[PDB]
Amino acid sequence: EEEIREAFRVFDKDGNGYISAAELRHVMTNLGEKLTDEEVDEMIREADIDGDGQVNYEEFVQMMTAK
Numbered sequence: 001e002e003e004i005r006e007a008f009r010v011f012d013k014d015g016n017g018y019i020s021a022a023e024l025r026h027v028m029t030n031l032g033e034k035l036t037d038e039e040v041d042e043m044i045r046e047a048d049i050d051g052d053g054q055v056n057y058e059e060f061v062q063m064m065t066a067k
Contacts, residue, residue: 008057018054
């Protein structure tokens with residue numbers, strides 16, 4: 001799990017908590033996860049993303065660990 005958090009951090013130059021959704025979909029595709037683009041889109045629609053610009057990757061990390 002920490003590895004998922006550090007990759008997300010690799011995508012957070014300011015080590016704070018928010019990165020752009022494209023960056024998030026990208027961190028998730030590099031970690032070697034075999035989650036499909038549609039499932040990602042379904043996880044994105046239930047997450048608040050396009051309509052605000054930046055997402056807190058911590059909630060997406062928590063959901064992937066639970067699953």
